[PDB]
Curated annotation (Swiss-Prot):
Monomer; does not require oligomerization for channel activity. May form oligomers in the membrane. Interacts with SLC26A3, SLC26A6 and SHANK2. Interacts with NHERF1 and MYO6. Interacts (via C-terminus) with GOPC (via PDZ domain); this promotes CFTR internalization and thereby decreases channel activity. Interacts with SLC4A7 through NHERF1. Found in a complex with MYO5B and RAB11A. Interacts with ANO1. Interacts with SLC26A8. Interacts with AHCYL1; the interaction increases CFTR activity. Interacts with CSE1L. This is Cystic fibrosis transmembrane conductance regulator. Changing L212P: In CF; impaired maturation of glycan chains. Changing V141I: In CBAVD and CF; uncertain significance; found in cis of the IVS8 TG11-T5 allele, which affects exon 9 splicing; no effect on protein maturation, trafficking to the cell membrane, nor on channel activity. Epithelial ion channel that plays an important role in the regulation of epithelial ion and water transport and fluid homeostasis. Mediates the transport of chloride ions across the cell membrane. Possesses an intrinsic ATPase activity and utilizes ATP to gate its channel; the passive flow of anions through the channel is gated by cycles of ATP binding and hydrolysis by the ATP-binding domains. The ion channel is also permeable to HCO(3)(-); selectivity depends on the extracellular chloride concentration. In vitro, mediates ATP-dependent glutathione flux. It comes from Homo sapiens. The lineage of its organism: Eukaryota, Metazoa, Chordata, Craniata, Vertebrata.
């Protein structure tokens, strides 16, 4: 197994109300877990626990190896679009090209005279919300890691573009990788190996899309 939570309860503030309550799941190596639930349900907090920023007050957690995290808040640092995606990782042309293709960024980049050397975050280009989101996703996917934590990475994208990038990037390009995707969309839950729906910190549902269909 690659990631396990067993009877996990946790608090952001001692004496407070629990942000996660008796959470249980298991992800095998290479599987996809979809994490869903309304605002404040605890989805980002669950990712923070995997990254060691929140410790459990009850229960056990298993995870090993390097993590790549994509925040639900897209961000850019001053530098080229290539520098933002590589972000200090060693460069490889094939790997880089495959990521920008999977994130539909080749279309955006081809329109600039400077191509991948277009400068972001320095007052020149003003990126759209969807461009910043796809760049942030590409940055997280380019990093080599054992576990990918993709926190609602499809911000500002229309539903067809989100569907296409879910398929090209999360399902195809990342097919061999252990993935946790915070998402609410039906196709993503249907394609996931497991689904965890959180509600006010509790497990609203844990299982497969097919199991939920049969209910
Ligand atoms: O650092 C933190 C983070 C979160 N919290 C508190 O943990 C609770 C869950 O906060 P989350 O940030 O985990 O919820 P979420 O990801 O499911 O919500 P969305 O992004 O979809 O909007 C929230 O009630 C928050 O106030 C803290 O107290 N401190
Ligand atoms: Mg969140």
């Amino acid at each position: 197994t690659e990631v396990v939570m067993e009877n996990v309860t946790a608090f952001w503030e001692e004496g407070g109300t629990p942000v996660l309550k008796d959470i249980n799941f298991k992800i095998e190596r290479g599987q996809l877990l979809a994490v869903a639930g309304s605002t404040g349900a605890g989805k980002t907090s669950l990712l923070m626990m995997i990254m060691g920023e929140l410790e459990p007050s009850e229960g056990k957690i298993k995870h090993s190896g390097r993590i790549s995290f994509c925040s639900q808040f897209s961000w850019i640092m001053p530098g080229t679009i290539k520098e933002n995606i590589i972000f200090g990782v060693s460069y490889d042309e094939y790997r880089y090209r495959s990521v920008i293709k999977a994130c539909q960024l080749e279309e955006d980049i081809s329109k600039f005279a400077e191509k991948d050397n277009i400068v972001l975050g320095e007052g020149g280009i003003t990126l759209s919300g969807g461009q910043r989101a796809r760049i942030s996703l590409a940055r997280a996917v380019y990093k080599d890691a054992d576990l990918y934590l993709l926190d609602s990475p499809f911000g500002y994208l229309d539903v067809l573009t989100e569907k296409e990038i879910f398929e090209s990037c999360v399902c195809k390009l990342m097919a061999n990788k252990t993935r946790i995707l915070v998402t609410s969309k039906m196709e993503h839950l249907k394609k996931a190996d497991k689904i965890l729906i959180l509600h006010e910190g509790s497990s609203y549902f844990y299982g497969t899309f097919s199991e939920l269909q049969n209910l």
